């Protein structure tokens, strides 16, 4: 069977810098991860079982809020993907959106990032909500992360690992 | 094994109403695609061999010109997913980037997970509608070594 999950971040009602929980399961017991791949709700992490090249995904859906004018609240939100252990390049592994007024609106941000990783057997992974909002009072709830948009993260298994490599 | 592909953009030194044309392979022979996935060099489309819930991606990389200078050039670029037989989902299945009077590399990605059938075939059509400027299409290109690039990933087989 393909060794693939996709999870669906839990609502978050205004942003803030935290690690973010994840819905590992639908509405129902039907997981949203293959076997070889667990999530550990107390660490919000996703732990791999086997090593190789994984396609890493995240997929960022900041919502506007009834306080979100729009216009006036600037800076960035980021998805940081926290490895452990970090791999070659855990240096700036995030999906970033900066907020300028040039192109800022009081509209759905929908942005996709991924990256093609080697893991270690036992690799844990949890994704970070970073945001540094300005510009207006209490900036930081103008944008919530919800359901029906949802944010997910997953990955999936591209090259098993060569042991003789 | 897994089935998957990523394949490379051709080079494009101007954007143009245009499907993308495909490297399947690396400057050496190393394949781009796995076993059950083929590339078609002639219709510029991905072939799927076997039926099944993929990951399909697009990835687009906008490198700047020499000519990409101030705040005028405004629009929009898409690549647009083109499925034979067409996909139940939506006749919308693209990746938009809109351009405002803003200058750096745009990188963009997109994904879908969509049922595919037995031979389904996957080409991409590049989009772009620039103004503001005289020739605002020359200002953006597609280019190596920032390669745009498409793919996709059996999630679930429909016949294991
Ligand atoms: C690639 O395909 C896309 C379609 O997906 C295509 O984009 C379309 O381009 C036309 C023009 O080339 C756009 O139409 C414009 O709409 C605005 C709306 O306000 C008008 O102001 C424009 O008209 C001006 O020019 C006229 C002279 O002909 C004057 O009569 C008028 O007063 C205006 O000054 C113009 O009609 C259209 O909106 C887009 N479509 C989308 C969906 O954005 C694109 O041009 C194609 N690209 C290439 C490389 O050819
Ligand atoms: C979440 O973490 C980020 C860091 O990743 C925090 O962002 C940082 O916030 C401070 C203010 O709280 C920023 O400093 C400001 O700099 C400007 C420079 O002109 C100055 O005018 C201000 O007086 C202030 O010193 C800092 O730039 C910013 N860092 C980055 C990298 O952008 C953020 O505050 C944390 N968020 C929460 C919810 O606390
Ligand atoms: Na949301
Ligand atoms: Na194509
Ligand atoms: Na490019």
């Excluded at 994840?22 to 107390?42: F, I, K, N, T, V």
């Excluded at 919000?44 to 396609?55: H, I, M, T």
Aim: hydrophobic letters at 40%; one cysteine or more; proline letters at 5%.
């Amino acid at each position: 069977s393909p060794v693939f999950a996709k999870l669906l971040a839990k609502n978050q009602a205004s942003l803030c810098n935290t690690t973010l929980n994840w819905h590992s399961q639908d509405g129902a017991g039907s997981s949203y991860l293959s076997q070889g791949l667990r999530y550990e709700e107390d660490k919000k992490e996703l732990v791999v079982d086997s090593p190789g090249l994984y396609y890493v995904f995240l997929e960022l859906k900041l919502s506007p809020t009834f306080t979100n004018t729009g216009h006036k609240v600037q800076g960035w939100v980021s998805l940081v993907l926290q490895a452990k252990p970090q791999v070659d390049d855990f240096d700036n592994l995030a999906l970033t959106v900066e907020l300028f007024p040039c192109s800022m609106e009081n509209k759905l941000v929908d942005r996709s990032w991924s990256q093609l990783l080697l893991l270690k057997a036992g690799h844990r992974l949890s994704v970070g909500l970073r945001a540094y909002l300005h510009g207006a009072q209490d900036a930081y709830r103008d944008w919530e992360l919800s359901y029906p948009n949802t944010t997910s993260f997953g990955l999936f298994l591209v090259k098993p690992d060569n042991p003789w490599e």
